[PDB]
Enzyme design. Structure first.
Site, short mmCIF file in Angstrom:
data_model
loop_
_atom_site.label_atom_id
_atom_site.label_comp_id
_atom_site.label_asym_id
_atom_site.label_seq_id
_atom_site.Cartn_x
_atom_site.Cartn_y
_atom_site.Cartn_z
N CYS A 86 38.04 31.74 46.93
CA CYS A 86 38.22 30.43 46.31
C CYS A 86 39.33 29.67 47.03
O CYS A 86 39.23 29.40 48.22
CB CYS A 86 38.55 30.59 44.82
SG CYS A 86 38.03 29.25 43.72
N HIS B 244 44.35 46.46 31.30
CA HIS B 244 45.29 46.27 32.40
C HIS B 244 46.16 45.03 32.20
O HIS B 244 47.08 44.78 32.98
CB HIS B 244 44.55 46.19 33.73
CG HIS B 244 43.99 47.50 34.19
ND1 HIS B 244 42.67 47.85 34.03
CD2 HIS B 244 44.59 48.56 34.79
CE1 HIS B 244 42.47 49.06 34.52
NE2 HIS B 244 43.62 49.51 34.99
#
Lengths: 257, 241
Positions: B146, B89
């Site tokens: 995060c 990808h």
């Protein structure tokens, strides 16, 4: 060694090979030099690998130095506003860069600069290094900047792969139609992989493209040649950086006198 | 191994983390790798590769094809410093669309992955906001982890539809301490946890455990340790709905 060094920071990205690394009365007005820099470091080659390039530091500082001395200060802008990207493997000049680092590290976005134009800019400077091949040639904002420049009879300075930026005038007016320039010759870009300068070949070649859009590349060799066409000044390679600054100074000075 | 910040030659005064410390769906990724710290030194960061692959790999199975976009259009910037599916990808991350252009124009998402790279640009992006408003005004899923949630800071000077929402996020405390081990060449010039709080969001964690969390169509994680478990949730929540 003539093998491409690796840039650990990026996927499948390479610096130039080890071998090729060493081969390789002022003006007291208000007019500043608009510098269009590169915001991307990595150029994809034909074999998927990434060339770790950017703007060429000697090419972009030497001229700016001669101009700074001649009373011509500068400001920097990238298409995105992201920090300039320099080929640091090609880095008097040091203190100059250090003293002006901020301008490159925090440039304006080019679109913003363009929407405020009509303008105390005395030149558009597009420095070379293969970094100029990323984005500039497709920028509508670069396009317009350049339109503004010639339209208001201002100076346009470039060298190396700088001129690839002109490719952005490919669809509209193209006020650079029928101008002649010095520029980095394609024939040299086809044979640089040999000594591991790049990890691959360029997908397209800017010199050929500029010929199609009416520009006359007057040189097919690398000699440090510089050229004048009205107010468009150019150089062919890193070897021309000093002479280009010498020209830009002694042309914008007599123009403003 | 030394707690010395490793140099990154590609950029002037830029550092990787210390060798000691290293041991539809629409994706909005970082187009810039270097974040300036409070001592002028640049932190060589970017998106966290595991944090943006694992969640997307779980997603992407149960059949949800992703699509990348960065503010400028420039290629995704990944924290490759450690740190199959990627290669396959990679082309989408390396050739993303401009966000502004995707704004004018269908998706079942917005995913904003972590890594300190998310702190660059996204937090201040008018495009990110406008995209983020679209996802809420249309009851779409919003996934982040995060420092990813630092992107929500874009709605700041708007009406802010994320008011009240509770989330997981990387704790400011933990960032205030990473330099002391070389993870970062310096301290951050500002902290997004405080900012998100000021904006009106609930950060339901003050520690790093790998905890993921759900609040309406807004799913989050706290650290790399949550990447997996987060993919687990994004899958379930998107599948069943």
């Amino acid at each position: 060694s003539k093998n491409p060094q690796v840039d650990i920071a990026e996927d499948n990205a390479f610096f130039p090979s080890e071998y090729s690394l060493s081969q390789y009365k002022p003006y007291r007005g208000k007019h500043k030099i608009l510098v269009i820099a590169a915001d991307e470091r990595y150029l994809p080659t034909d074999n998927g690998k990434l060339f770790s390039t950017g703007n060429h530091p000697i090419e972009t500082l030497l001229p700016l130095y001669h101009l700074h001395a001649a009373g011509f200060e500068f400001e920097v802008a990238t298409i995105s506003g992201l920090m300039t990207k320099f080929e640091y493997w090609a880095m008097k000049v040091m203190p100059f860069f250090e003293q002006h680092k901020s301008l490159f590290r925090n440039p304006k976005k080019l679109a913003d600069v363009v929407a405020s134009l009509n303008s105390e800019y005395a030149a558009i400077f597009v420095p070379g290094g293969h970094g100029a091949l990323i984005g500039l040639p497709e920028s509508q904002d670069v396009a317009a900047a350049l339109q503004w420049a010639i339209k208001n009879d201002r100076f346009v300075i470039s060298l190396c792969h700088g001129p690839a930026a002109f490719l952005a005038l490919r669809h509209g007016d193209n006020p650079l139609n029928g101008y002649s320039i010095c520029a980095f010759p394609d024939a040299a870009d086809k044979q640089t992989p040999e000594i591991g300068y790049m990890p691959g070949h360029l997908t397209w070649y800017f010199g050929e493209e500029l010929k199609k859009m009416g520009m006359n590349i007057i040189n097919d060799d690398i000699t440090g040649r510089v050229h004048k066409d009205r107010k468009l000044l150019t150089g062919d390679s890193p070897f021309a950086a000093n002479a280009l600054g010498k020209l830009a100074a002694q042309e914008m000075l007599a123009a403003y006198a």
